[PDB]
Design a protein around this ligand. Structure first.
Ligand SMILES: CC(C)(COP(=O)(O)OP(=O)(O)OC[C@H]1O[C@@H](n2cnc3c(N)ncnc32)[C@H](O)[C@@H]1OP(=O)(O)O)[C@@H](O)C(=O)NCCC(=O)NCCSC(=O)/C=C/c1ccc(O)cc1
Length: 431
């Protein structure tokens, strides 16, 4: 899998954008320290026109006017707090070629030679050097191309990120902005003074293994990334179930699915009865914060639900028990709880310390991020919607994504990184 960079360009906003510093809220700070990798794959239309770099770059430049912070840089304020320096410095746009064909990627598992479709950032050099957004269009010998996205998560969550990407693809089709970015994270400013109302389990350290894992089995070595498809039908049966073993309470499709994955993972890993496993579920607070956020709110509004169970219970009890634990946390996360969370974060002396990076997600724990509602397939640059869109490679073991069907259809895909031996067993999944 060899990549030949053809051309590299620092694209700037088409016109003068505001020169300003953009404050980060507590949840723009407690985010991963890296560029979130995502990848789109497109079949060729057969037209010579296909993904014309000039069309792409002119559109990019246009989109970087309403979404100008995306073209800025990181800097710290006088208190060492990370903020966005909106200096319109720009976004990296790379074009590459490869002798490989798209079909080499087979099923499109986020293995991380898929990371080669995204330009790599050399982190430091400084905090202020590397651009917030990197982009690579890669032309395959088969005629198709990929779009690789690397987005510094301080700029935005996947929700605002997609807002920008889709807006970009729109402008490439001569269309204009639809919902303008609303740019002001101070709506998530903590209350003054901070008064937490809950004990927030989502910010407490993850359970470690009672018996220390074999390092020759648990490194990034011997960590495998795979994908699996549920049909629907299996998704129909999965949600029901639920009535299993006399149980009367009806849980939601996500809840039953996430519990099933969670449970399937524990079985695959052979967790002993007394072992605790913590599940990390990324939750969007746009819909829950009850003063109610503007459409096109530009930033991070991701909170975290973390149900916990002893494996003895999780794996021996029916799947609706796992779904129950999940539901029990998800339902507690109303505006009041979220506001409590912001105030809790406000009282911590260093938010960088609360950033999960697995350790957090390593065995015996797990993260399930669902993109099922994200408009991940709307990025049509003029040559059609992507045949696939997924995480640009899963770094940590124990991290997993739920992807919606490109065709649609009511099938889902689960993309997961597990220890290699554990991965073969993870087919408690279709079980
Ligand atoms: C997982 C949640 C918490 C719930 O999902 P669900 O259970 O499947 O929800 P459903 O779709 O089944 O049903 C939701 C509906 O339930 C309804 N509901 C409410 N309570 C009830 C009730 N008590 N009874 C029955 N119905 C009810 C409620 O109205 C709600 O409606 P609505 O919210 O308007 O769709 C979901 O809302 C959520 O918070 N998702 C988080 C978004 C997410 O997964 N993001 C992934 C980010 S990963 C990342 O780092 C991104 C990096 C990235 C960066 C840049 C990029 O370009 C790309 C990626």
């Amino acid at each position: 899998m060899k990549i030949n960079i053809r051309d590299s360009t620092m694209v700037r906003p088409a016109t003068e954008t505001p020169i300003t510093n953009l404050w980060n809220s507590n949840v723009d700070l407690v985010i991963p320290r890296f560029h979130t990798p995502s990848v789109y794959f497109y079949r060729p239309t057969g037209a010579s026109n296909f993904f014309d770099p000039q069309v792409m770059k002119e559109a990019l430049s246009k989109a970087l006017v309403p979404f100008y912070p995306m073209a800025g840089r990181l800097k710290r304020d006088d208190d060492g707090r990370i903020e966005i320096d909106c200096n319109g410095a720009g976004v990296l746009f790379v074009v590459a070629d490869t002798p490989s064909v798209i079909d080499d990627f087979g099923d499109f598992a986020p293995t991380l030679n898929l990371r080669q479709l995204i330009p790599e950032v050399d982190h430091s050099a400084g905090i202020h050097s590397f651009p917030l957004l990197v982009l690579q269009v890669t032309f395959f010998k088969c005629g198709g191309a990929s779009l690789g996205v690397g987005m510094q998560h301080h700029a935005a969550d996947g929700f605002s990120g997609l807002h920008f990407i889709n807006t970009w693809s729109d402008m490439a089709r001569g269309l204009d902005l639809t919902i303008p970015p609303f740019i002001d994270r101070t709506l998530l400013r903590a209350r003054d003074p901070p008064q937490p109302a809950f004990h927030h389990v989502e910010y407490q350290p993850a359970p470690s293994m009672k018996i220390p894992l074999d390092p020759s089995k648990s490194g990034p070595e011997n960590t495998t990334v795979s994908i699996f498809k549920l049909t629907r039908d299996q998704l129909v049966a999965l949600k029901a179930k639920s009535k299993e073993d006399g149980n009367t309470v009806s849980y939601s499709s996500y809840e039953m699915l996430a519990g099933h994955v969670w449970r399937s993972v524990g079985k695959a890993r052979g967790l002993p009865n007394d072992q605790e496993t913590k599940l990390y579920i990324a939750t969007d607070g746009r819909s829950r914060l009850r003063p109610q956020l503007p459409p096109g709110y530009f930033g991070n509004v991701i909170f975290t639900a973390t149900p916990l169970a002893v494996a003895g219970d999780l794996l021996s009890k029916p799947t609706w028990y796992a779904a129950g634990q999940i539901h029990d946390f998800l339902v507690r996360m109303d505006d009041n709880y979220l506001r409590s969370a912001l105030d809790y974060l406000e009282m911590q002396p260093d938010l960088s310390a609360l950033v999960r990076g697995a350790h957090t997600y390593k065995c015996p724990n797990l993260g399930i991020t669902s993109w099922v509602r994200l408009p991940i397939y709307d990025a049509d640059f003029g040559w059609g919607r992507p045949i696939f869109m997924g995480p640009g490679g899963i770094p940590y073991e124990g991290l997993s994504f739920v992807l919606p069907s490109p065709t649609n259809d009511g099938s889902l895909s689960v993309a997961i990184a597990l220890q290699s031996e554990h991965m073969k067993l993870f087919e408690k999944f279709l079980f």
